[PDB]
Design a protein around this motif. Structure first.
Motif: not given
Lengths: 70, 76
Positions: A62-70
């Motif tokens: 169950r891998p999870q990844f979150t990408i954030e910018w700004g």
């Protein structure tokens, strides 16, 4: 504008997450795999590979990844 | 500004990818798994599920994702 690439590779007891930032601003990537969390900043044009190890292969179900910018 | 969440679930012969767009603009997500490519647009504040099937579990050993924002609503 911008694009982020994430490749996940499963090899034996390891999971490699390759991250490419093809945008003009840095991005922050949060990766959670079971009880292990990891955060990296990927700069414009930079490739970051993060490797996770596990005592059992079921940990990478169950891998999870979150990408954030700004 | 903005953030995108991707959750990958491996259950039997399937790989479900739940996508959440927490930014103020639509994002385009491309997912490649072996010989299969799936593309969806995720609007601000929405969740989209993309499911892949396979005749063998080893097909999900190298998933690739691309998140795009700030395009012309077709390929970005």
């Amino acid at each position: 504008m911008g694009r982020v690439e994430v490749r996940v590779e499963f090899e034996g007891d390891k999971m490699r997450v390759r991250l490419r930032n093809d945008s003009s601003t840095p991005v922050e990537v949060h990766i959670k795999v079971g009880d292990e969390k990891r955060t990296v900043t990927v700069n414009p044009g930079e490739e970051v590979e993060v490797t996770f190890s596990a005592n059992d292969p079921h940990k990478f179900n169950r891998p999870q990844f979150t990408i954030e910018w700004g």
